[PDB]
Motif scaffolding. Structure first.
Motif, PDB file in Angstrom:
ATOM      1  N   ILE A   1      11.581 -31.881  34.943  1.00 43.32           N
ATOM      2  CA  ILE A   1      10.337 -31.176  35.191  1.00 43.32           C
ATOM      3  C   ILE A   1      10.191 -29.965  34.282  1.00 43.32           C
ATOM      4  O   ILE A   1       9.089 -29.689  33.801  1.00 43.32           O
ATOM      5  N   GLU A   2      11.287 -29.281  33.938  1.00 42.84           N
ATOM      6  CA  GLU A   2      11.155 -28.159  33.014  1.00 42.84           C
ATOM      7  C   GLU A   2      10.860 -28.599  31.585  1.00 42.84           C
ATOM      8  O   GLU A   2      10.589 -27.744  30.740  1.00 42.84           O
ATOM      9  N   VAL A   3      10.928 -29.895  31.292  1.00 40.76           N
ATOM     10  CA  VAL A   3      10.382 -30.407  30.044  1.00 40.76           C
ATOM     11  C   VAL A   3       8.886 -30.649  30.183  1.00 40.76           C
ATOM     12  O   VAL A   3       8.109 -30.342  29.271  1.00 40.76           O
ATOM     13  N   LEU A   4       8.453 -31.152  31.342  1.00 33.97           N
ATOM     14  CA  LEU A   4       7.072 -31.595  31.513  1.00 33.97           C
ATOM     15  C   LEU A   4       6.089 -30.430  31.553  1.00 33.97           C
ATOM     16  O   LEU A   4       4.944 -30.576  31.111  1.00 33.97           O
ATOM     17  N   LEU A   5       6.514 -29.276  32.065  1.00 27.03           N
ATOM     18  CA  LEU A   5       5.650 -28.098  32.069  1.00 27.03           C
ATOM     19  C   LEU A   5       5.386 -27.588  30.658  1.00 27.03           C
ATOM     20  O   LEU A   5       4.252 -27.227  30.329  1.00 27.03           O
TER      21      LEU A   5
END
Lengths: 41, 50, 78
Positions: free
Chosen positions: B19-23
């Protein structure tokens, strides 16, 4: 007796995932679209 | 972007380092609405009792 | 978002039917037109004021009910 093992054919056709893939071939139709105010007299 | 309607889904449930890639890859339109509800971690999977 | 609880046509009907009702005062009665506002602060013209009171006691009592019904559904959405 054809109805017994074409019943088992369809369940073996469905666990493999072939009913959906044929459904993707013909029926891939998904194009389906979808505050407060006041008026009176 | 389609939301809960139009065949889309309401929320994606993924692990924190996905998720910290997707943001960053998207714009500032999403935010993790909760905390981690199963906090375990990653790791290498070996042959058993090696 | 301020003027949202009425339709854009309703903000012209309501502001329109305060001047046409305000023109009914001239039948009972820029600087000359402001003389009616000194008379409409608080016979047959009193009966115009009674019905016009219950109009404003509905446009008060509906603009509340459409500013509540926005400020709850904005909260109680999915």
């Amino acid at each position: 007796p054809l109805a017994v093992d074409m019943s088992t054919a369809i369940l073996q056709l469905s666990e493999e995932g072939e009913l959906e893939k044929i459904h993707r071939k013909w029926l891939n139709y998904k194009h389906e679209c979808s505050l407060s105010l006041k008026s009176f007299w | 972007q389609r939301g809960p309607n139009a065949g889309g889904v309401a929320a994606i449930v993924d692990e924190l380092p996905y998720i910290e890639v997707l943001l960053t890859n998207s714009n500032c339109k999403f935010r993790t609405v909760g905390q981690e509800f199963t906090r375990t971690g990653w790791g290498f999977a070996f042959q058993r009792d090696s | 978002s301020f003027l949202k609880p009425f339709t854009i046509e309703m903000w012209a009907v309501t502001g329109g039917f305060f001047l046409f009702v305000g023109a009914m005062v001239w039948i009972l009665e820029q600087l000359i037109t402001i003389f009616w506002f000194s008379f409409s602060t608080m016979s047959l013209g009193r009966f115009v004021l009674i019905i016009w009171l219950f109009v404003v006691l509905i446009i008060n009592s509906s603009y509340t009910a459409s500013l509540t019904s926005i400020l709850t559904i904005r909260q109680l959405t999915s």
